[PDB]
């Protein structure tokens, strides 16, 4: 938590997730409906099994 303690925090590896989310949002309904799971969690995992 102490930011004075060493930490490395600059590389695109940090940002690929949100960059990809932006890209599929720009793509339209095809990508979003296609990759539904990370946006819409299952109503119940017990049913999902």
């Amino acid at each position: 938590d102490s930011n004075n303690i060493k930490y490395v925090r600059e590389d695109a590896k940090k940002m690929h997730k949100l960059w990809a989310h932006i890209r599929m949002a720009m793509e339209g309904s095809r990508a979003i409906k296609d990759n539904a799971k990370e946006f819409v969690p299952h109503p119940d995992n017990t049913k999902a099994t």
């Binding site: 296609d34 990759n35 539904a36 799971k37 990370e38 299952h42 995992n45 999902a48 099994t49």
Partner: protein, 53 residues
């Protein structure tokens, strides 16, 4: 390609002459037909936690 094109000859006595003839070889190119078995297009049922397009 003619086999006996060049022959020994005897000008002193040619005697008889061996007959010759020319032929025509035939090459080939065979046609094969490939394909694909009928592929089912399934509904996206790998959706426990994994995604399915």
């Amino acid at each position: 390609k003619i086999q006996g094109l060049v022959r020994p000859r005897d000008p002193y006595s040619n005697a008889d002459v061996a007959a010759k003839d020319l032929r025509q070889l035939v090459d080939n190119t065979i046609k094969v037909a490939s394909g694909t078995p009928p592929i089912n297009i399934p509904p996206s049922m790998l959706r426990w936690i994994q995604k399915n397009p």
